Amino acid sequence: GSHMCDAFVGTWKLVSSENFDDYMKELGVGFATRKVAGMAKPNTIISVNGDVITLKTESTFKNTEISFILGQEFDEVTADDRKVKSTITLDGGVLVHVQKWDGKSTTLKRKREDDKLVLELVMKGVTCTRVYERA
Ligand SMILES: O=C1C=C(O)CCN1Cc1ccc(Cl)cc1-c1ccccc1
């Protein structure tokens, strides 16, 4: 059967970025790591096996990999080495990824728009948009 996650499965590559440095400053990321991470052009591979979704990111900055079930909280080590409690849910056809640590929170939304996968990262008043195309 078909699922709302179907539209996300596959391999994706970063094509544009807006406000990422501001977002990283909200996370408390330092000057040198902002420079290095901001240069990266990540590729992401999204796949599904039964109820388990896997989101694997490979880049010249860091490589990350999470596997999860919608709605079930998990431990995640972010690219910038935060140790966070994460939950990913569907809100309609949008994957909503909330990361919580030290009393703080950031939300990452992934949506399909035209032939793109658009990742929005929000921390306090800062919104970053990261557009990916199929690789
Ligand atoms: O997974 C992603 C994918 C993006 O397009 C933007 C950011 N991150 C996570 C992330 C958070 C904080 C920091 Cl400092 C860096 C990243 C990042 C950047 C480039 C490659 C991989 C991860």
Q: How far is the CA of 37 from the centre of ligand 1 (A)?
A: 7
Q: How far is CA 66 from the centre of its chain?
A: 10
Which residue's CA is minimally distant from atom 20 of ligand 1? 42
How many residues are present in the chain? Answer: 135
SS3 label, residue 25: helix
CATH number where 36 lies:
2.40.128.20
The answer to whether residue 11 sits within a structural domain is yes
DSSP H helix total and E strand total for the chain: 2, 10
The answer to whether residue 68 sits within a structural domain is yes
The answer to whether residue 128 sits within a structural domain is yes
Ligand 1 pocket by Cβ (under 6 Å):
14, 24, 27, 29, 33, 37, 40, 42, 57, 59, 61-62, 78-80, 119, 130
Q: Quick count: other Cβ atoms within 10 Å of Cβ 116? A: 15
The answer to whether residue 117 sits within a structural domain is yes
The answer to whether residue 102 sits within a structural domain is yes
- In angstroms, the CA 62 to CA 110 distance is 20
Longest dimension (CA), the chain: 47
**How many structural domains comprise the chain?**
1
Check if the beta carbon of residue 129 is closer than 8 Å to that of residue 119.
yes
Of 79, 117, 114, 113, nearest in space to 99 by CA: 79
Check if the beta carbon of residue 74 is closer than 8 Å to that of residue 66.
yes
The answer to whether residue 85 sits within a structural domain is yes
Domain range enclosing 114: 6-134
What is the edge-to-edge ordering of all strands in the sheet holding 83-91?
Answer: 64-69, 52-58, 43-49, 10-18, 126-134, 116-123, 104-113, 94-101, 83-91, 74-77
Binding site listing: 130-132
Element (H or E) spanning 35, and its range?
A: helix 31-39
The answer to whether residue 1 sits within a structural domain is no
